[PDB]
């Protein structure tokens, strides 16, 4: 299954269409995914949507079509790596949209970097990815977790808390991020009661042990740096243990994750203050999402599966699912800018006056035979503006930043569903000590109480 | 340059023959190594030595020759990855000796795992490599750093110290290891004055900052988890800063590293207590090392370089160098067992009675057409004995353990060189609290003083 389309310029794509895959008595026989990832399918959608829009856009890259080769990482390096090999078979993909996971992106960046194939991630936020010495051809349209780690400490200090816990996934997006927060704390005089590591495949024993350490601890505030899949197993047992009254500080990855944000668990996950990326605006994207259908599209071979999953195999709106059930496009917007950033780099090459080329002898690149390294060069020196009206320009470490959005989980009496209410903002562009804004109101501590909890 | 030799069974090899490699105005043009790694060349030597010995060994694998395909990782994933691709071009290498670096091995294990190619590392000691969920085809002949992290804490508690520092390389062999030690401390009531991260390519500013944090701190004991190259830059400035009286606790990687262990720095690096792996015994290896010569051997294309480096381009003994200047073979012995472990696995396949096969239907594998996954199966269930007289059998996470050797750096008045005197032992096979033995004598605190230093 691969969303593929013919084009003069081919752009690779790696998306988590699923959440994870299922001795050697025989051939390994590969492995199969076992959990469809709605929203993740809406991701590749944006990518394809942006490609179509730019093809229909005469101003951007005229007399030139752009094709795409998009696969499924399924939150597994193995499937992601097999794909990355398929991308560098000739070395042709001029660029590949980075994967979402920090660990998955790390591995793909290793191979892609060897051939200097520009990789623009849309979710990877691991500080380790900023090592251009190893990740030379890595670029990310999402802020690193260094800023996030700082914001959490600010919030804990803001509510006068000195006794807190810690739970991070045993992988790139968590262990490194927590390290930064640990350093953020202690300096602000915030003692850490306990530190725990969880995984999507933690043994039931491990889960029991971490739940045991969650209890016992007198700390009521517990910071959590983990994606939805890794924290899914832990929260499940916490729910049956019915451990309530523990306030959780989400970490973006699971701040808007439906995997954890479900009414059946609101008893414990209720009132979880987390961090969301600034909501972007992709116009005409809603209609594109509704115009999906098997037999139709054809290129997006991923539709069949989607349809089977959304219709137990008919209007998409008929069946509720995170695919079209969205209020703010955040990571989806990141993907849109990611493909647009490459589009502008290619357009720059298409429009480079001789003697004004960033290449040697001020020479330009023949887009008729553009090379990936040439795109990387331009991508490094990219300074265009966003559709939202915002100058976009990757930094020296190929990273662009943006303010966060403090969010608090609240229950809606209309449908009993979990509505995420913005409660404050964190201005990254601001100065230190004047970057955090949290309206004390709109904060339902522990899902209901409106009195700041005690955590000393 | 590749040490290659024809054989029915081909075993890959990745060794750090060097210590590291040297915009996009033009094609990247690859990169070149810039520091020969003596001892590292002595490593591949052992590998080749073991291959020859087993070929000349009729009992082990009769009527069967074994060829090798060995390259240079040069402490760089990029060169290492390019090699790993060369190994899986057909997928043929039945097995590849793992690299030395934790980060380099991690990446190679990703690709090798995809094709289930058994990888047996000889130095990689990163706990993260024990994640068989990701590293399914990873096996290591060296203990993880979890045991080491425990030993350090024991030593600090043994000498009644509560105020200590921390300096780890910003990579797999350091950041994860220190995390374990941090947890080891605090529990033993050992406060950490400061924690710093260093790299082989840390900016001079970074070096100045870490040296500044090294000073100021009242902590006299400073634990250091880093390989020789990463700590080389920091120690250089500490020497010019002439910061003396600071006791250092080596971490195996640099406990016997000539890069740091040099008389010109004994003023600061003097009296550094570190951890060394149990010394193994490879018989007849000395003569093999002396029988090296360009024009001769031919297969080891790495000789030319070696010769140029050892003779500024003649008897090898004439020129002193860590290649033949060795008193205890440790990692070299690890490589010997690594290739022997594969040899025994292949011999098991060569001798499997029908109906007694670890494969389905109790079927054996046709060694005439042996597959890598079949070798992996056998490697998992390997239980042979060492030449030193020791049963060798990888654990569930493909890791074998061994007692460590507390070492203290001492100056020899005969040549003014830095002699490493064994001072104690750490029995991993022993119980908790009864595994650490450090003779208080033979300990020259700060290189000279014989009075336990004060670090509160």
Author numbering:
A (entry chain A), B (entry chain A): 24 to 45, 50 to 118, 137 to 358, 399 to 541
Pull text from the paper.
By adding calcium ions, γ-EVG, and two PAMs, etelcalcetide and evocalcet, we obtained a cryo-EM map of the active state of CaSR at a resolution of 3.97 Å. To obtain more detailed structural information about the binding mode of γ-EVG binding to CaSR, local refinement of the VFT domain was performed, and the density map resolution was improved to 3.55 Å. The ligand density of γ-EVG was identified in the amino acid binding pocket of CaSR. In our cryo-EM structure, the amino group of γ-Glu, namely the N-terminus of γ-EVG, formed a hydrogen bond with the main chain of Ala168 and the side chain of Glu297. The carboxyl group of γ-Glu formed a hydrogen bond with the side chain of Ser147 and the main chains of Ser147 and Ser170. Glu297 of CaSR had no hydrogen bond with L-Trp. These results suggested that the hydrogen-bond interactions of γ-Glu with three residues (Ala168, Ser147, and Ser170) were conserved and may be important in the binding of amino acids and γ-Glu peptides to CaSR. Only valine and norvaline at position 2 in γ-EVG maintained high levels of peptide activity at the CaSR, suggested that the second residue of the tripeptide may be tightly bound to the pocket by forming hydrophobic interactions with the hydrophobic cluster of CaSR. The carboxyl group of the glycine of γ-EVG formed a hydrogen bond with the Arg66 side chain. The critical role of Arg66 in the recognition of the carboxyl group of the tripeptide in our CaSR/γ-EVG complex structure was consistent with the structure–function relationship shown in previous studies. For Arg66, which interacted with Gly in γ-EVG, mutation to alanine reduced its function compared to the wild-type, but mutation to a negatively charged glutamate residue completely abolished the activity. This observation strongly suggests that both the hydrogen bond formation with Arg66 and the positive charge of Arg66 affect the γ-EVG binding.
We have previously reported that the calcium-sensing receptor (CaSR), which is expressed in taste cells, is involved in the perception of kokumi substances. CaSR was originally identified as being involved in regulating plasma calcium levels and is central in calcium homeostasis. CaSR is activated not only by calcium ions but also by a wide range of amino acids and γ-glutamyl kokumi peptides. We have recently found that γ-EVG functions as a positive allosteric modulator (PAM) for CaSR, similar to some amino acids.
